[PDB]
Amino acid sequence: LRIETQLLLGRLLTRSGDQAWDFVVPFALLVIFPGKLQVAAFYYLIVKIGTFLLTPSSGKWIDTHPRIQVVKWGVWLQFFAILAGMVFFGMLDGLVRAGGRESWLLSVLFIALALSGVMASLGSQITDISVGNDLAPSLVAPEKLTHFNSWLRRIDLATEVGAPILAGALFPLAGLFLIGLWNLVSFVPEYFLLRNVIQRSGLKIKVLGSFSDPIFWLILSYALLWLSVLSPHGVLLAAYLKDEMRLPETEIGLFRGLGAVFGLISTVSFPYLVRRLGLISSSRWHLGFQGVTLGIAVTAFAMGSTASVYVFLGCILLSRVGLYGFSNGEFELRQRLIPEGRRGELNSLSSLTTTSATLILFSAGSLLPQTEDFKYLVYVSLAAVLLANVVFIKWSSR
């Protein structure tokens, strides 16, 4: 197997486990704490805030340690965070059936589960930056990164779609433990693939404030897109389509499942324009395409009838092609421009800015819960996309 293929292989194997575990966690939490949707929501809060605080620290860490040390810590931190996740899950489940739903021990085991969620989240982040933003631009020719990145995206999408199917089949919470074992095993092949490629190549040879770097505006333009509720899997939109739009749930599900389809189209359209028009302009056209498509979607949203609801949803799906396109573009731009010595720091600034956006989106769905308040979330989402377009146009003047 070639170098570029080995990198994609380890990614594919570990992702299918990631997407599987990330799928059953809310459902498992629902089994242990039924009727309390606040539990699953509070779990993901601790993870995101936990990963947040630990992001700049890990960034400086990646830049001051051997690559084989980042990979080792990056992967095995996930391995034991999931292993502990299974244990605490089993203890939580076992204790509840035993009748201890109102004890301090239940809370301690939940914080433990949450904290293990933080570590897995962190290790996954350290690994993403290591594999995709350090090892890849060090092993793969610059003219072949666009091809590399497309297959990364398809891995994400394939496993995203493959997760509810396989894990849904496998899943007292015994199916959850078959998911975790899958997830655990899935970590191993990549670590050794990553270990061995380092040991036999020049990757061993690497010599070991952030907002004031020009590439932050590239980072900011991508993070702004995370401040959006105009997404097929967005819960606020799914709820809105159900009650205010009075759409069939069968059609809401179809709209949801077509997100990965249009995302896959980007892996065809975006590399094509890069080969024809170049990296920057391709990112511009795709990012602009998202703006125009969403701009039409919002125009139809108000007003406003139940006849424009498909123009609303249809243009959202079209914007997914543009969104996923610019995503690979901004990603490759960080692969190409970020200096080797600051790959851990600057890419962590990226994760920090996207995590912040997600946290704001959490706080927006909590402070604006009404379905009559959804109207403002549409207007703000569009604004964030339009601002992103301006910020990226300005930056691309380089």
Q: What is 334-396 written as a DSSP string?
A: HHHHS-GGGHHHHHHHHHHHHHHHHHHHHHHHHH--STTSHHHHHHHHHHHHHHHHHHHHHHT
**Closer residue to Fe ion, CB minimum distance, 18 or 134:** 18
Q: Which residues bind Fe ion (CB under 5 A)?
A: 14, 17-18, 183, 186-187
Single-letter amino acid code for the residue at 282:
S
Q: Are 298 and 291 in contact (CB under 8 A)?
A: no
Query: Given the structure tokens 């499942």, which residue do they identify?
Result: 257
**Closer residue to Fe ion, CB minimum distance, 124 or 283:** 124
CA torsion sign for 324, 325, 330, 335 is positive
CB 18 to Fe ion: min, Å: 5
Q: Are 128 and 348 in contact (CB under 8 A)?
A: no
Three-state SS for 147? helix
Task: Give the residue at shortest CB distance from Fe ion.
Answer: 17
Three-state SS for 323? helix
CB 17 to Fe ion: min, Å: 3
CB 77 to Fe ion: min, Å: 12
Q: Is 78 annotated as a binding residue?
A: yes
CB-based contacts of 196, cutoff 8 Å, min separation 6: none
**Closer residue to Fe ion, CB minimum distance, 118 or 349:** 118
CB 59 to Fe ion: min, Å: 22
Cα-based distances in Å from 103 to 95, 98, 107, 113: 10, 12, 7, 16
**Closer residue to Fe ion, CB minimum distance, 81 or 298:** 81
Q: Is 183 annotated as a binding residue?
A: yes
Q: Is 328 annotated as a binding residue?
A: no
Three-state SS for 140? coil
Three-state SS for 149? helix
**Closer residue to Fe ion, CB minimum distance, 10 or 322:** 10
**Closer residue to Fe ion, CB minimum distance, 130 or 146:** 130
Q: Which two tokens stand for residue 182?
A: 């899958």
Q: What is the CB neighbour count within 10 angstroms for residue 231?
A: 20
CB 244 to Fe ion: min, Å: 39
Q: Are 345 and 57 in contact (CB under 8 A)?
A: no
CB 55 to Fe ion: min, Å: 20
Query: Closest Cα to residue 120, out of 187, 31, 42?
Result: 187
CB 347 to Fe ion: min, Å: 20
**Closer residue to Fe ion, CB minimum distance, 9 or 238:** 9
Q: Which residues are annotated as a binding site for Ca(2+)?
A: 18, 78, 183, 190
Q: Which residues are annotated as a binding site?
A: 18, 78, 183, 190
